[PDB]
Structure formats: C-alpha cells, structure tokens
Design an enzyme around this catalytic site. Structure first.
Site, PDB file in Angstrom:
ATOM      1  N   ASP B  25     -44.515 -30.967  12.079  1.00  0.00           N
ATOM      2  CA  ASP B  25     -45.139 -31.728  11.028  1.00  0.00           C
ATOM      3  C   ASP B  25     -44.233 -32.755  10.356  1.00  0.00           C
ATOM      4  OD1 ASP B  25     -46.718 -32.680   9.114  1.00  0.00           O
ATOM      5  OD2 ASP B  25     -47.199 -30.642   8.219  1.00  0.00           O
ATOM      6  N   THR B  26     -44.369 -34.020  10.825  1.00  0.00           N
ATOM      7  CA  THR B  26     -43.541 -35.072  10.291  1.00  0.00           C
ATOM      8  C   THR B  26     -43.905 -35.416   8.855  1.00  0.00           C
ATOM      9  OG1 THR B  26     -44.991 -36.776  11.231  1.00  0.00           O
ATOM     10  CG2 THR B  26     -43.121 -36.106  12.579  1.00  0.00           C
ATOM     11  N   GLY B  27     -45.088 -35.059   8.415  1.00  0.00           N
ATOM     12  CA  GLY B  27     -45.490 -35.279   7.030  1.00  0.00           C
ATOM     13  C   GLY B  27     -45.069 -34.221   6.060  1.00  0.00           C
TER      14      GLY B  27
END
Ligand code: GR6
Ligand code: NA
Ligand code: NA
Lengths: 99, 99
Positions: B25-27
C-alpha cells in the site's frame, strides 16, 4: 518515472478543469477526490477504509490527467482526507509495483 | 517481481513464524496489521484514514518478512479492515512505483 517511497507519492492531476494534488495509492481499489463538482450523472455509494465508511458520489466515464498521462474511469467524490488515485486509474497509466 | 494493479497487490507476510496476507500500500505511510501478539513494549498511536481515526498500538523493531524479503521495523496493531504494508516497510524491501 520511477517513484521511490521515502515520501508520499504525490502527483499533480487535472480533473474537472481543476489542478489538484493526489496520492498514488495501490491500496485503494477506487479513486476518491475531495468535494468538487463534476458533470453528468452520479449515484451514491459507501466506501470503507481504515476508520469506517464515508458516503461518496460516484461519477462514471470521467477523464483525468495524472502526472501527464490521460485516462478515463470512475471517480468517487466525497470527504476523503487526501485525494487518492486508486487502482482503477493507476492501471490506465501503466503503473506497476517493482521490487 | 513486477506487480500490475488489475487485482489488489496482496502478498504473503510472515510475522512471529505465522503467515498472513497483506496489501502492498503506497498510500499508507505506516504498516497496520490486525490484532495479534507481538513482543516488547508498545505505545498507542492514532492514525487517520478514510472514515476517521483509529487507535493502534505501535511496536518498533519487529522482524517481518514480506514476499520473501526480510524487514525489521515498526508495525502498528489495531482494527484495520485489511493488513497493510505501508511505506516504512515498502522502502525496506526496495519497492518502487513505476510508470
Ligand atoms: C500512517 O499510516 C497510515 C496507514 C494507513 C493509512 C493511512 C496512514 O492514511 C493516511 C491518511 C490518508 C488518507 C487517504 C486515503 C486512505 C489511505 N490509507 C491507505 C489506503 O491504501 C487504504 C488501505 C485500506 C484497504 C482496505 C480497507 C481499508 C484500508 N485504502 C482505502 O481506504 O481505499 C478505499 C478506496 O478504495 C477502496 O478500496 C479499498 C478500500 C477503499 S489508510 O489505510 O487510511
Ligand atoms: Na458520467
Ligand atoms: Na519493540
């Protein structure tokens, strides 16, 4: 580009004639933008994230520009704390995770 | 590997000799895992996502393997709907977003 992840992966987007900053978010199925008007039809939807659910307006067939790359897809509009580009539009700019 | 985003980027992780599934999860700035037992001391933290804030327990210097890559860092434990590998550990495994 290759974007490393030392900081949040924020990019500029153009949506509904407006420039906004948004997070490239591989953990988001959906693209969710803060309150704004978009043309055309919409329907309500509930989306759930780490702190519960929010009500959003679902707009389909919305053209967006993400870091220079044009795409089209569904955009959800509502009270998200951060604008997020989710997988439904990340695929359309050819984004991949690499390690 | 190179991971496209047509499905959720789910991988196997290993924490405490047990396998779990988690989302790359880059967010997410930080890694958040469902309730489980971890060693050592913790401290409560509030994190804000879509829906609102939740209280989590912060454990530092935890050994965790992600898609076969060994990491040692901070794991937040709390009522997340999905296990999330955030940027603090995505950088440890050398992950980048590319388009
Ligand atoms: C500090 O460490 C963190 C750790 C985690 C988050 C965070 C800071 O956020 C910081 C503030 C940014 C908020 C702005 C957006 C939300 C950012 N988040 C990571 C995100 O990938 C979550 C991860 C996820 C995934 C599944 C369930 C719940 C959460 N996905 C999410 O909310 O997606 C929604 C939009 O598409 C739909 O698909 C999945 C749910 C829904 S997060 O979980 O709130
Ligand atoms: Na439409
Ligand atoms: Na510790």
């Amino acid at each position: 580009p290759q974007i490393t992840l030392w900081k949040r992966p924020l990019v500029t987007i153009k949506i509904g004639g407006q420039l906004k900053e948004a997070l490239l978010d591989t953990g988001a199925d959906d693209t969710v933008i803060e309150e704004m008007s978009l043309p055309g039809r919409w329907k309500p939807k509930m989306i759930g994230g780490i702190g519960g659910f929010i009500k959003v307006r679902q707009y389909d067939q919305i053209i967006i520009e993400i870091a220079g790359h044009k795409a089209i897809g569904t955009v959800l509009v509502g009270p998200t704390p951060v604008n997020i580009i989710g997988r439904n539009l990340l695929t359309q700019i050819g984004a991949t995770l690499n390690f």
